[PDB]
Amino acid sequence: KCLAEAADCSPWSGDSCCKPYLCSCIFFYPCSCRPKGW
Numbered sequence: 001k002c003l004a005e006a007a008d009c010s011p012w013s014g015d016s017c018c019k020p021y022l023c024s025c026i027f028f029y030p031c032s033c034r035p036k037g038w
Contacts, residue, residue: 003033 002018003009009023009031017023017033024034 005033005035007033009033 001015003015003021003023004018005021007015007017007021009017009025011031020036021033022036022038023031024038025031
């Protein structure tokens with residue numbers, strides 16, 4: 001199990017982002033797994 005594209009990430013514990021998506025924690029977008037090279 002893993003977080004798909006545009007999936008909210010767990011603050012301390014939960015599911016990990018699906019590869020090769022990366023959790024984006026930018027300004028406009030909160031911590032959420034986004035595509036690789038979004």
